[PDB]
From Swiss-Prot:
This is GTPase KRas. Alternates between an inactive form bound to GDP and an active form bound to GTP. Activated by a guanine nucleotide-exchange factor (GEF) and inactivated by a GTPase-activating protein (GAP). Interaction with SOS1 promotes exchange of bound GDP to GTP. A motif (Effector region) lies at residues 33-41. Signal peptide: none annotated. Interacts with PHLPP. Interacts (active GTP-bound form preferentially) with RGS14. Interacts (when farnesylated) with PDE6D; this promotes dissociation from the cell membrane. Interacts with SOS1. Interacts (when farnesylated) with GPR31. Interacts with RAP1GDS1. Interacts (active GTP-bound form) with both SHOC2 and PP1c (all isoforms) to form a tertiary complex; SHOC2 and PP1c preferably bind M-Ras/MRAS, but they also bind K-Ras/KRAS, N-Ras/NRAS and H-Ras/HRAS. Interacts (GTP-bound form) with MAPKAP1/SIN1; inhibiting K-Ras/KRAS activity. Glycans are attached at residue 36.
């Protein structure tokens, strides 16, 4: 049967979670997507010769630490932790998302990728070295993406699938 992988995209508002997801789903850049919409989207893809079904939850909205939201996030098999390379605050929020994932999955070993998005923009405030070093601190891959140009988009999502496969 076709394996389904449940991927969750997290990160500060405005980093490009929706734009990255919609680039994977539609193969089109969106400059506008209601910031409040949290939804899931599926796509069949071939990864390492295997056709698999990705189910991508594009998160949104305010923090909610209910038992119900925790149980829902625990359905995620792997997480993309996204910041924007021109927004320091988004990078400094990554530890919060990482800690919430560790908490809800009750594991220090959750499939995860650190994603530095908006790599097409000239306004960089987060050095690549600092981001690489954070991914090294976590023991996870780091991928530089642009939802606008498609830079890194398959690399980010496919790497996460490969991390889930290895965790199994
Ligand atoms: C960086 C902080 C603190 N400073 C203010 C902004 N902020 C902020 N804003 C908005 C949202 C989130 C946030 N935090 O965790 C989460 C989010 C949204 C995605 C879901 C997730 C991560 C995956 C595991 C769990 S489990 C659970 N119940 C969650 C929730 N909700 C989460 N943090
Ligand atoms: N240039 C550029 N803009 C981007 C990129 N990704 C997202 N954006 C823009 O950043 C803003 C927020 O993107 P959005 O996907 O709504 O972020 P979300 O709140 O994380 O879902 C929008 O205007 C997007 O067009 C990217 O890689 N490059
Ligand atoms: Mg969004």
């Amino acid at each position: 049967g076709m394996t389904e992988y449940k991927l969750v995209v997290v990160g500060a508002g405005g980093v490009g979670k929706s734009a990255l997801t919609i680039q994977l789903i539609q193969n089109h850049f969106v400059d506008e997507y209601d910031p409040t919409i949290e939804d899931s989207y599926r796509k069949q893809v071939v990864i390492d010769g295997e056709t698999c079904l990705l189910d991508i939850l594009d998160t949104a909205g305010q923090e909610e630490y209910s038992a119900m939201r925790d149980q829902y996030m625990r359905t995620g098999e792997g997480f993309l932790c996204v910041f924007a390379i021109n927004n320091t605050k988004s990078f400094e929020d990554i530890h919060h998302y990482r800690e919430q994932i560790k908490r809800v999955k009750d594991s220090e070993d959750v499939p995860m990728v650190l994603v530095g998005n908006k790599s097409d923009l000239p306004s960089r405030t987060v050095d690549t070295k600092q981001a690489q070093d954070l991914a090294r601190s976590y023991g996870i891959p780091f991928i530089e993406t642009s939802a606008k140009t498609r830079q890194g988009v398959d690399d980010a999502f496919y790497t996460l699938v490969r991390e889930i496969r290895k965790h199994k």
